[PDB]
Symmetry: D2
């Protein structure tokens, strides 16, 4: 055989990857996550899982064919979760997605059922992984993942408001004529309609925009900055109306969380976690606060000082979500 | 104004971009090209153009929402080609795409008709650009873009066999247990059914595989390496048969070429250029031969030493391409 | 020729060229970081000692397989620098153990008297990025000698200082410096001003959780962190004889914003006449928006009366030196 | 405390680094390896070791102050090898370096003594580490590291001729006006005066240059390509006499090797390994041949096809190296 004429083998390795990532779901969101993860050199193996055989294999092959341009030496796929074995990070994007007009809350039973199958299969093959939940409603499904996995809460993370805050800083950048890296602001709580823009923290170079304009984010705001937050909330509906779905921004957002997890950076991201203990929250509610994300998932939470009005929203969002998730059957 | 309280403007802005790239066509190929180029930090400005307004705007927005995770401070879109002004590189992906069972060669009339509209509009606003033709049949469409543009031939490049060769190298590495980066081999000629695998150049670490197994790639081969070329030829069709279209790998192939152009690398790539005066071809045929690629496009061509069979196969590719080029009007 | 039978040639200026003046330790650190962030299609190096220059060039060139900057050149002659987008000046006398950066001022004015016209001659449209010390005063000098508009004469300023401050903050809090925000402004030196009002994590003002933050009264002595920033160059010089890596990385970051027109904000040396009670041609670090045309805008940070005194002080000290200079 | 007010700790846990690298030696080579490794994002922890405490602490400090601009969250140092605990890769650059007119083979007795202390101490705390030897004479010292450590050969690698071939390819590129990446060719054997340029494998785009001119590399070469190899043999000495030492190129060479190991890429590199069994070599000689480098070090060796002259030169190199091995006093 040619190969053995060309190559003398020295040892038969256990081929166990050290930086394996799995993306479950090869719809648009999942493939966007896949490509962004590949072009950020985060993993040594990328596994794809979904339930339509032909599409799954088509996507696997299409990624495969770009390998010369990448630094991820093994890309694999299967309906069978054995393909996901030994992943450090499993990112779940499967499920029904919101159609035009449709609230993310309408996705909940469909996606809880899909997770009843998905989550046990992930755990069986990567008992030590971190879970990053992207499917919607992300806050409730992060909770569902947690319960079915049995994982300690540090290892079950939701993409949450990471994107909402990225979008926020982009709009702001565009208003100010400044790169969004240098524009800071946080959108926290539910990923969706009831999110809370924390106006008090919104700053460029440590200079608080609220201190310069005390009306910032109020109906009295000469410049209507509140519409920046409306734009954030409406963003995914707007994009779904225009192109049918969202992919690139969320892929990029998930990749950025993957980077923090895989490289143990300990950056701060506003992502979905279990916040019992805070802002008046007595139950097992997951929603977005600034979290320090690392190799062990969410290790620490930053306590943001909310105004009474700001804190009032949060407990609302909070109450809503508990009402829905309280009564789920799985 | 909250901006002026925050920011003292010190300089009047005549913003002209220095490294602007345009992608024409926002189908799955174009957006794969876009995302890949954004994640390789090649452009200070990215313009998108296509004819379905809503689709266009939603793609634009979706990418803009990822701006925080990117280094391309300006992303814009319009059906109007003035949005493409001052581009250093324009990448043309618009046009009809082959169905399952349909040759890329069957796309020629539809895509020539669209090229009569696209190329003059590109050239109008970006007199300095290189044109990177992706739309199919890419080799004939490179020729066509050249004829319409009035650009010199060095500035009109077809994506050509850059993908075919990545696939070949990928499949080769899989067989040998070597990264594609370290497996060498060239697929030349038409980007399509009549492509030519140059077995004589196929090597790992400078070791010719054909000299190891002389019947490499013939029907006599005990290991049927020709099936590797058959897989290269078929791959678009297999992927299309499975997922509907191809996107990620062609996108990576095009970002690779764009890297070489924008960063003046002078790397060698198998891409579409005029081969008149080689291999006994005296007509204006464009097909892939290995080309040195830089800031002024294709500046040099490597004359591959071809075995009589290989050269005959290359001439037959040229013959097939000329059979369709022969009859064109525009 | 072998070549002409291998290659048929069809066709006979760089577009993203950076020059680095000075191939001492900081200059070479600047060189390597720029080469690893793929910011340039040509890198040129200039200094006055010819073997040293040549050998740094060759050493970089030998790693070309691993880089994506296809042309690396060097020369004593400034014609090598032609068509630069950005010229980074690191040449001059360098800080010595237990000595202020202000002790280098006069000697470095004298070399810039030679360097700067030569840079301007071969790239009259470049951005100048000054790194040599004392950078604030030398950015002023570069600006007067060059005749460039002020947006194009940038001083590396307090970019490193704030990065140091952000590392140390991050060590204290157990958070990546990327998620620890805070600004050190004014003189790149002993009179720098930590702005405690802006120091935060996830938008949460550290000063609101401890109003005494950064003062004599702070139970947690956060003032020490700025003292550590002030003293770090002296420490590093004591231990290893100079500093190089951290400055290289600061300068690469600035170069990144410039070459890629990012319009990020940086605390870098710019002309401050007409802010903060300053009516002279002084340069010091304030948060500047940095892009392809250099410094286009400045953020007006809101300063507490000390912060402004302490800064108009820093401003004073420095115009105190730049006053009696002649050129 | 302000920390505790700002940040609720959710999780105690022992931080075990997953991708740690140590560099032994903080002279110019060691630090060049370090800055390159940090700038390619290969490690989640970097540890430095050397014998002079101030110098080591100052180098550590200076890197640390650039943390804002890096993605390697933990940088540490110590005279004490416990700081290197749980490394995946330990790079050894400590020892004497050659003077103008001095062979790297003159460094052997001094560097063997240093290695007697360093090696048991570096392998003590790192069960999973690979040893990448950089100090000279690298081939002999890779052998010595192998004998002292008791590691299996796949885990003990010499930087070898990775840089010689890089230099070869740069010079080649400058002759032909092609980027090094697309110029191919191997310098094998000793990293030093008895290296062997493999002209039979030297190619652009699969095109063998010897095929085009069989005088290539001989005294009858009208173009004197032998001089390119000569330039490779003398490079270090040339640079040593212009600037006092070499640093950047070797740093990049080693970071490239580190990349293949850390990212399990399985690329081929000419690096030091045991060649007992090949080219009629019957003893435990170490020298550079092309090896597949991955997460377990060298898993495979490519059997280069040598001409009788090439092979004689390799065997001659092997004799010289074996001859100094007979001098080794353990
Ligand atoms: O764009 C956004 O805001 C998000 O997009 C997606 C989120 C999850 C999936 Br699965 C698909 C798209 C969102 O819907 O939260
Ligand atoms: O995957 C491949 O081989 C190629 O992909 C595309 C090339 C151009 C466009 Br427009 C769309 C797809 C091909 O179909 O030639
Ligand atoms: O480390 C720092 O803070 C600074 O570093 C340098 C700045 C310029 C040159 Br030239 C050399 C070192 C400083 O010493 O001011
Ligand atoms: O430039 C080169 O070829 C090599 O550089 C170094 C190799 C190891 C150390 Br420790 C220091 C320099 C060489 O001298 O072998």
């Amino acid at each position: 055989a040619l190969k053995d004429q060309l190559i003398v083998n020295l040892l038969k390795e256990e081929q166990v990857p050290q930086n394996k990532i799995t993306v479950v779901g090869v719809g648009a969101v999942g493939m966007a996550c896949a490509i962004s993860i590949l072009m950020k050199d985060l993993a040594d193996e990328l596994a794809l899982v979904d339930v339509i055989e032909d599409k799954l294999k088509g996507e696997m092959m299409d990624l495969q064919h770009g390998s010369l341009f990448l630094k991820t030496p093994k890309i694999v796929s299967s309906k069978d979760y054995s393909v996901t074995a030994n992943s450090k990070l499993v990112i779940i994007t499967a499920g029904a997605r919101q159609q035009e007009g449709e609230s993310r809350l309408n996705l909940v039973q469909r996606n809880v059922n899909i997770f009843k199958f998905i989550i046990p299969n992930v755990v069986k093959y990567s008992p030590q992984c971190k879970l990053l939940i992207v499917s919607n409603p992300v806050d409730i499904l992060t909770y569902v993942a947690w319960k079915i996995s049995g994982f300690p809460k540090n290892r079950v993370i939701g993409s949450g408001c990471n994107l909402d805050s990225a979008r926020f800083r982009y709009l702001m950048g565009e208003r100010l004529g400044v790169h969004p890296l240098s524009c800071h602001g946080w959108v926290l709580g539910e990923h969706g309609d009831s999110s809370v823009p924390v106006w008090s923290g919104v700053n460029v170079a440590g200079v608080s925009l609220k201190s310069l304009n005390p009306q910032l984010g109020t109906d009295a705001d000469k410049e209507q900055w509140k519409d920046v937050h409306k734009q954030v909330v409406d963003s995914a509906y707007e994009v779904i109306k225009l192109k049918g779905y969202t992919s690139w921004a969320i892929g990029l957002s998930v990749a950025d969380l993957a980077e923090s997890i895989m490289k143990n950076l300990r950056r701060v991201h506003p992502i979905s976690t279990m916040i019992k203990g805070l802002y008046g929250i007595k139950e097992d509610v997951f929603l977005s606060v600034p979290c320090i994300l690392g190799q062990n998932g969410i290790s620490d939470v930053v306590k943001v000082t909310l105004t009474p009005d700001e804190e009032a929203r949060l407990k609302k969002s909070a109450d809503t979500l508990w009402g829905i998730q309280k009564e789920l059957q799985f």
